[PDB]
């Protein structure tokens, strides 16, 4: 559809809301289209009309959210992207240990605005924490560039114009940009000047598009092999481009957890990342010890090495480096994850698992517990992207001790 840049130009837009007499999208009546001539009531329904295919038997191809008619109150959202399902924003859990605990769905993700799909905007976070960016204006075109104008050339520069776009910058089986044609940006997100016309403020992006290489055929379970995304240089600065006061390139002279190009691993931290396998099983290696729940920047922009370190198979499970950096997106899965702060981690209880009597592991036996937190064992399994009770310690503590071994 997109193929690096702008797409089939009626795929998202519509001109008269009519094609063969029929309404092109029933959210608005015929002979009136909607906002910015799009197919939908908002700027995100024109994304969610072929993304979010209603009716799924697993994470299929490129979809990023699951229809509400597919999920009851007993199952998890059924698409496993590196961004995660937006269906997690409509999950409010109530478990009754020593009182009650409400883990509402507002805190689990970016509440995009989509009236026809009941994606209500975030009510508690009225603006972005860090900047002045509104949450009643956040759409899918608010951080992605829907036209995909941003290119990359043979010298790695990124420009809004010049040589035309031939394919996507992600997907390691892509092509290199030539002297006659450019390759589009990684996951066509805007940068260094991007602002939608629908915004009436000084909300211009001032950070470049993040260099990374995602793997093709990425919607998968991670019970067998892990999804390695290259995450090269500018992911933390791009997340800082709208959450201004959050990133931290200098630790400590800000007293925030470091995230940026200057947020290097120590030689101590990189050894603790490579050693950690389970709780107390500090026997890991440089190679064959990687966790997608805590990635790192590997802070170069050499796309040959980035396509080398981007593989669906386990042939590229190299661990940390002393010169490796810290992502924003190390914790905080990008779209939504279902863990009350959009993080990849269960941080509301002290150990993420339960050992059943003869000591193998489970996630629990009952939603009304403190360890499992008002959900099924299948929903906690799918929240860890199909990672079952094994690959973890039986009483494994919170997974953000990966690169400190504070166990």
Per CB under 8 A, contacts with a copy of itself among 36-55 are 37
**Can you read off the two tokens belonging to residue 310?**
């981007």
Per CB under 6 A, contacts with ligand HEC among 124-143 are 125, 128-130, 133, 135, 138, 140-143
CA 85, chain centre distance (Å): 8
**Can you read off the two tokens belonging to residue 381?**
């399994």
d(Cα 109, Cα 123) in Å, to the nearest integer? 12
Per CB under 6 A, contacts with ligand HEC among 332-361 are 332, 334-335, 341-343, 345, 347
User: Closest distance between ligand HEC and the C-beta of residue 216, in Å?
Assistant: 9
d(Cα 145, Cα 147) in Å, to the nearest integer? 5
Burial class (CB in 10 A: 0-12, 13-18, 19+), 174: buried
Per CB under 6 A, contacts with ligand HEC among 16-75 are 16, 18-21, 36-38, 43-44, 46-51, 62, 64
Q: Which is nearer to a copy of itself, 239 or 306 (CB)?
A: 239
User: Closest distance between ligand HEC and the C-beta of residue 24, in Å?
Assistant: 6
Closest CA to 236 of 215, 258, 205, 213: 258
Closest CA to 89 of 49, 62, 125, 134: 125
User: Closest distance between ligand HEC and the C-beta of residue 167, in Å?
Assistant: 8
Per CB under 6 A, contacts with ligand HEC among 209-238 are 214, 229, 236
Examine residue 378 and tell whether it contacts a copy of itself (CB under 8 A): no
Examine residue 347 and tell whether it contacts a copy of itself (CB under 8 A): yes
**Can you read off the two tokens belonging to residue 307?**
């396509």
Examine residue 14 and tell whether it contacts ligand HEC (CB under 6 A): yes
* Distance set, CA 229 to CA 4, 28, 155 (Å): 18, 39, 22
* Distance set, CA 125 to CA 207, 223, 341, 346 (Å): 23, 34, 12, 21
Q: State the binding string over 207-246 for a copy of itself (x if CB under 8 A, else -).
A: --------------------------------------xx
Judged by beta carbon distances under 5 to 8 A according to partner kind, the member of a copy of itself, ligand HEC, none in contact with residue 141 is ligand HEC
């Amino acid at each position: 559809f997109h193929s690096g840049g702008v797409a089939e130009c009626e795929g998202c837009h519509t001109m008269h809301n009519s094609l063969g007499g029929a309404v092109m999208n029933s959210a608005t009546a015929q002979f009136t289209t909607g906002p910015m001539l799009l197919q939908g009531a908002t700027q995100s329904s024109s994304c969610l009309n072929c993304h979010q295919h209603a009716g799924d038997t697993g994470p299929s191809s490129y979809h990023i959210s699951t229809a509400e008619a597919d999920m009851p109150a007993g199952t998890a959202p059924l698409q496993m992207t590196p961004g995660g399902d937006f269906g997690w924003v409509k999950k409010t859990y109530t478990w009754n240990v020593r009182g009650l605990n409400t883990s509402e769905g507002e805190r689990k993700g970016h509440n995009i605005v989509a009236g026809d799909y009941n994606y209500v905007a975030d009510t508690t976070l009225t603006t972005a924490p860090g900047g002045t960016y509104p949450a009643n204006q956040l759409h899918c075109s608010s951080c992605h560039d829907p036209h995909g104008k941003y290119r990359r050339f043979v010298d790695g520069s990124i420009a809004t114009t010049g040589l035309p776009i031939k394919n996507s910058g992600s997907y390691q089986n892509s092509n290199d940009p030539t002297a006659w044609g450019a390759v589009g940006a990684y996951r066509i997100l805007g940068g260094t000047g991007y602002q939608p016309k629908s915004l009436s403020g000084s909300y211009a992006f001032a950070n470049q598009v993040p260099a990374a290489v995602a793997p093709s055929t990425y919607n998968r379970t991670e019970a067998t092999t892990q999804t390695r995304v290259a995450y090269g240089q500018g992911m933390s600065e791009w997340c800082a481009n709208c959450h201004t006061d959050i990133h931290n390139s200098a630790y400590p002279t800000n007293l925030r957890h470091p995230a940026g190009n200057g947020a290097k691993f120590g030689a101590t931290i990189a050894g603790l990342y490579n050693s950690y396998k389970k709780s107390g099983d500090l026997t890991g290696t440089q190679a064959s010890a990687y966790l997608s729940l805590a990635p790192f920047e590997e802070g170069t922009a050499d796309y040959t090495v980035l396509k080398g370190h981007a593989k669906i198979d386990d042939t590229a499970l190299t661990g940390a480096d002393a010169t490796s950096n810290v992502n924003c997106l190390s914790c905080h899965r990008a779209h939504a994850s279902g863990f009350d702060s959009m993080t990849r981690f269960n941080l509301a209880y002290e150990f993420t698992t339960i050992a059943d009597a003869s000591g193998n592991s489970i996630y629990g036996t009952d939603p009304n517990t403190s360890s499992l937190q008002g959900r099924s064992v299948n929903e906690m399994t799918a929240a860890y992207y199909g990672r079952t009770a094994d690959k973890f310690a039986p009483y494994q503590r919170a997974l953000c001790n990966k690169c400190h071994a504070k166990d």
